[PDB]
Curated annotation (Swiss-Prot):
Coiled-coil regions listed: none
Organism name: Clostridium botulinum
Name of the protein in its database record: Botulinum neurotoxin G heavy chain
Region named C-terminus of receptor binding domain (C-RBD): 222-427
Functional description taken from the UniProt entry: Responsible for host cell targeting and translocation of light chain (LC) into host cytosol. Composed of 3 subdomains; the translocation domain (TD), and N-terminus and C-terminus of the receptor-binding domain (N-RBD, C-RBD). The RBD is responsible for the adherence of the toxin to the cell surface. It simultaneously recognizes 2 coreceptors; polysialated gangliosides and the receptor proteins SYT1 and SYT2 in close proximity on host synaptic vesicles.
Lineage: Bacteria, Bacillati, Bacillota, Clostridia, Eubacteriales
Amino acid sequence: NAILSLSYRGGRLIDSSGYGATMNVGSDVIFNDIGNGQFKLNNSENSNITAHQSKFVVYDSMFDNFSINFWVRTPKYNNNDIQTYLQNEYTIISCIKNDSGWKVSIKGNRIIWTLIDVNAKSKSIFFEYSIKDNISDYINKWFSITITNDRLGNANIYINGSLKKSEKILNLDRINSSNDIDFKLINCTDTTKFVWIKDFNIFGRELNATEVSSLYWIQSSTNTLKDFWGNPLRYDTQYYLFNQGMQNIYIKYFSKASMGETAPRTNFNNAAINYQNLYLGLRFIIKKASNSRNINNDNIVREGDYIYLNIDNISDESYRVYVLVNSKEIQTQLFLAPINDDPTFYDVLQIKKYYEKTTYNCQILCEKDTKTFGLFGIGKFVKDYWDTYDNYFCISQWYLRRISENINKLRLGCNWQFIPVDEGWTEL
């Protein structure tokens, strides 16, 4: 029972809650109908949405509890402009009348919720994520934020469905907010900044932990395949390959053995920031296999589709990933070769999500028949001795049983993510 839910469908922004908020959209907003719909705000006057709430939805109360929820995708810092990134707080969503109400702000690597009462007393609570991780779960990635407010106790921030922070708000008096919610960058000094927003909802109660987790599961669209950024995985789109089990390597071509070998990610590191580079190694393109589901160019890949993994940066001609047919062994290297129909090898795959379905991981399956059946992962050249070069791109039957074992499956070597070049992640 959301009391406001923004959705973009049939080419228009609507309130899908049924409480009838009306929208006014500026001339410089980008929209799409992915899922419930997404939009992009840039740093200009015309890049704005105003949602006008009815008398029955607008918040004006000393005691009534309420929650808001949305997902955000905010770009990586510019390496040469970290001081302004860390120091500049800008609003992205606000509902303020005569200085009272609520607002969502970003300040670098922080997401901030602020409440201001009619006496100008204010309380803020923030979530901060690291800008020194080799690989970040949050930078330039879709993530979920749910903020719940108990007027007689705490404000709470939940990130990706789990409680991250709490702050006492009980000393605030009446919060008399605006009928209008403005989605708009305010006070953002960087002309190039933008933010992506999706799944904006308001609830007229304090959601509990169970409700927050359920909402996260629903909004994660667990049947859809996603890329590293949290966007739908697509055909005909160049992707670098990330292994969730071995995050510090990428795959390179080794011509002598028609092989994908591992090599260490390079990094950028100074006193303020650290990250490993993402746009490294073999560049893959997902292609629709013969007699699979009919698609248009750049369509979304589904778990039921049969696909090929082309590689466009080994030579001027396309290469593709091949599996040896009837290997009679538990593990074999994958073969990276020019396009061919040699019956010794086989190229029909599927991209699956067997567990951890709210994550952006996938598994890559070959299942021709029992003699050619396994999951893509990484094998060791030498097993009994720090060496980032000691591995190759393989297919193994070992993963088939492993993924049904009573274990944490988050960091298995058969977990992969696909990384397209994105405007919110620039590197050297």
